[PDB]
């Protein structure tokens, strides 16, 4: 079974400790010890849902759950602390989303209003890249009356409406009416929402659909030596990031875009007929001078060809600055197997570090744990691409004196 990272997202109080609670208790690994004292207190009180509360005080004190077909591991969410910061280093990542929406009379409209986080996650989900979002329209037994269809259709509508006004996708959010305490249309079907005949929010989970594979997107092949074979030729290396190369394609080379066809290919002194990401190879063009090759540079198919920018935009995580730094700065960028200076164009703005909205707006410097957003216009043409569709090819540390001053993703590229 695949293993993906959750995030459970939602405005404060509308149940996202609770729900989490429930799929840990129901579907997770809590230990005997602490099951057992559970149980044990359950007793003591003659009351079922004890059991309940004193796990959740216990994951409190501190997360993997299993589903059908997949391992889900649930992750920090916004509001704590380094959450950008380890967004941007890969330290964490989110795979999937379920956003905690209460249906609860005025928690709803405060989650949804200008400055409620049901608003801000739904915006921050779709700066994440979290397409297959699942929201929970949770306390459904708190509605008036208690269960209510019609209070259910105007949130999933009014929800659906706001998320098409910001691009945010549509055809893959899902949305389900739970009761996070009693794990009702989560874990097992709700026998007090008769008029709901959709998936359970773990049916939604199993329904979840994997990124593509880096096989399947176009060829990338980042180039990290060349070489001159006497009556053999050109012969560039290089590891497939995404992509297959075969003998016989024709290919491209940016930043020069010059096409050759390849001749041969091999991995390990051993001949091969085609390559795939992972693989790292010596490959024989025909049709390029060398001289129009350089490490660095990379080699994709001529339909596709690899980018190159003119500018990116990049969130960053500024690690390491002994003072300031401003626009202007030109530190060494290492991005795949390119080291290219590029100058700090423009400081757009600083982000929350615990939430990734903005939180000034053109600062005139960062300085170290400030996590931004920044465009850099590369000295020399450079090839790189957004995280979210090539992630070998789109993260990058900045470096100086030896050191990383900060690693950042690609958001944008104005391409050259
Ligand atoms: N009646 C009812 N209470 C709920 C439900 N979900 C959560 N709660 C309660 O509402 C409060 C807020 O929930 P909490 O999970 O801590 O949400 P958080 O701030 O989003 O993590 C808790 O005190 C729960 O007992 C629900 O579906 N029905
Ligand atoms: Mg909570």
Known sequence: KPHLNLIVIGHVDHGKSTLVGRLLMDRGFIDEKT????????????????????????????????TKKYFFTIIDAPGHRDFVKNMITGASQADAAILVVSAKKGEYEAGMSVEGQTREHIILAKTMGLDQLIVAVNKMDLTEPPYDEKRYKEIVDQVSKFMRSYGFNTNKVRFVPV???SGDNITHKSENMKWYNGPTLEEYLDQLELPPKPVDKPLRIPIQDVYSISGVGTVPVGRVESGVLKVGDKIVFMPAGKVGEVRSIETHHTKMDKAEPGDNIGFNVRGVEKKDIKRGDVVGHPNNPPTVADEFTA??????????????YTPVLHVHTASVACRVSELVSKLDPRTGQEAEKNPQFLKQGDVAIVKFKPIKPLCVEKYNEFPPLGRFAMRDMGKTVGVGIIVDVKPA
Do not use: C, Q, Y
């Open 35 to 66: 099951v057992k004292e559970a149980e044990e207190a359950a007793k003591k009180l003659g009351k079922e849902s004890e059991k309940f509360a004193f796990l959740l005080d216990r994951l409190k004190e501190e997360m993997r759950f299993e």
């Open 179 to 181: 009761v996070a305490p």
């Open 315 to 328: 969130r960053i995580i500024v690690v390491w600055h002994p003072t300031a730094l401003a626009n202007g």
